[PDB]
């Protein structure tokens, strides 16, 4: 139980470290929030 658990914690480092994209659920909201501040500012260039 300890060794399966140590091998299980072992791969949880690797899934982040080797970049499995799973943090996408945070990244995508950091992107989705930023794209709105970029969009908001960029419209000040428009003549209306």
């Amino acid at each position: 139980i300890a060794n399966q658990f140590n091998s299980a914690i072992g791969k949880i480092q690797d899934s982040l470290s080797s970049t499995a994209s799973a943090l996408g659920k945070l990244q995508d909201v950091v992107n989705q929030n930023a794209q709105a501040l970029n969009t908001l500012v960029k419209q000040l260039s428009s003549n209306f």
């Binding site: 970029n38 500012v41 960029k42 260039s45």
Partner: protein, 48 residues
């Protein structure tokens, strides 16, 4: 290092001006970021 309004070569803006570590190529005069907002200018007399 003061809040001033400015006009440089007709480009009008406002802010705190300061010395820059950036290096434009000899033909660029005004910097613009991702946002398309004017973050830096070459001075037309010291050329820095």
């Amino acid at each position: 290092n003061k809040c001033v309004n400015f006009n440089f070569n007709g480009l009008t803006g406002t802010g705190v001006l300061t010395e820059s570590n950036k290096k434009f190529l000899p033909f660029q005069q005004f910097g613009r970021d991702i946002d398309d907002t004017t973050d830096a200018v070459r001075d037309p007399q010291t050329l820095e």
